[PDB]
Symmetry: C4
Subunit: 25 residues, 4 copies
Amino acid sequence: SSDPLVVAASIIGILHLILWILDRL
Amino acid sequence: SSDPLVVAASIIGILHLILWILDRL
Amino acid sequence: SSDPLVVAASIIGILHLILWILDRL
Amino acid sequence: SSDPLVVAASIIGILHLILWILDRL
Ligand SMILES: CCCCCCCC/C=C/CCCCCCCC(=O)OC[C@@H](O)CO
Ligand SMILES: CCCCCCCC/C=C/CCCCCCCC(=O)OC[C@@H](O)CO
Ligand SMILES: CCCCCCCC/C=C/CCCCCCCC(=O)OC[C@@H](O)CO
Ligand SMILES: CCCCCCCC/C=C/CCCCCCCC(=O)OC[C@@H](O)CO
Ligand SMILES: CCCCCCCC/C=C/CCCCCCCC(=O)OC[C@@H](O)CO
Ligand SMILES: CCCCCCCC/C=C/CCCCCCCC(=O)OC[C@@H](O)CO
Ligand SMILES: CCCCCCCC/C=C/CCCCCCCC(=O)OC[C@@H](O)CO
Ligand SMILES: CCCCCCCC/C=C/CCCCCCCC(=O)OC[C@@H](O)CO
Ligand SMILES: [Ca+2]
Ligand SMILES: [Cl-]
């Protein structure tokens, strides 16, 4: 388990990457 | 809970993203 | 130890960086 | 505490940001 803030950052970073890729596709 | 260094990195990454977005808005 | 989602994000971020560098080299 | 791989990713990400900023300064 992780600090909730670290969980939140991790979700944000993954979503960031997915959106960036979709934007380029 | 997380290593303090991981907490720090997570805060930095979120702030990074917020600043980048504000810069573009 | 970390939340599995944080582990996954960390692996993704490292791979992201490695691919970006290889792309530029 | 965190998974060592998460610690490593966090260090890499911070160093990444510091290098990127120094490169731009
Ligand atoms: C298109 C807009 C996209 C915006 C993405 C950037 C969003 C930035 C906002 C981040 C909010 C983080 C929410 C964080 C929510 C969890 C905070 C918490 O309760 O921490 C407690 C622990 O420390 C206890 O150990
Ligand atoms: C260019 C923008 C790219 C980012 C787009 C993101 C859009 C949606 C924003 C995502 C923020 C989701 C943060 C969600 C973070 C939830 C943290 C959590 O797990 O709650 C606490 C538990 O750990 C138990 O205490
Ligand atoms: C506009 C400038 C923006 C600069 C952003 C980049 C900043 C880079 C500096 C990072 C400082 C990280 C602070 C880290 C502070 C926590 C360190 C710690 O005590 O770790 C102990 C644990 O390992 C025990 O398990
Ligand atoms: C382009 C620059 C984008 C980044 C801008 C960032 C500006 C502000 C810098 C943020 C650094 C905040 C790091 C703060 C990290 C605090 C770590 C902590 O939580 O203390 C230890 C506890 O976990 C308990 O031991
Ligand atoms: C070239 C394409 C590259 C795509 C990279 C982006 C991929 C985005 C997808 C992310 C999938 C994340 C998998 C996450 C797998 C672990 C989820 C989990 O079981 O969490 C449980 C814990 O919360 C219990 O505490
Ligand atoms: C521009 C694309 C850059 C990203 C390319 C990534 C391509 C490959 C995708 C990587 C996703 C790997 C996620 C793998 C995450 C595994 C999480 C895990 O460790 O399982 C659970 C355990 O913690 C125990 O419960
Ligand atoms: C200028 C080049 C910059 C390259 C930056 C990218 C480097 C990519 C390489 C990453 C190596 C990660 C090292 C990771 C070292 C810790 C691995 C580990 O022992 O994990 C065990 C835990 O899972 C047990 O729970
Ligand atoms: C554009 C390149 C930007 C990245 C430049 C990075 C250059 C230096 C590379 C950094 C990799 C450092 C990874 C160091 C990761 C150490 C993980 C660790 O803490 O060991 C295990 C403990 O947690 C206890 O088991
Ligand atoms: Ca932990
Ligand atoms: Cl963690």
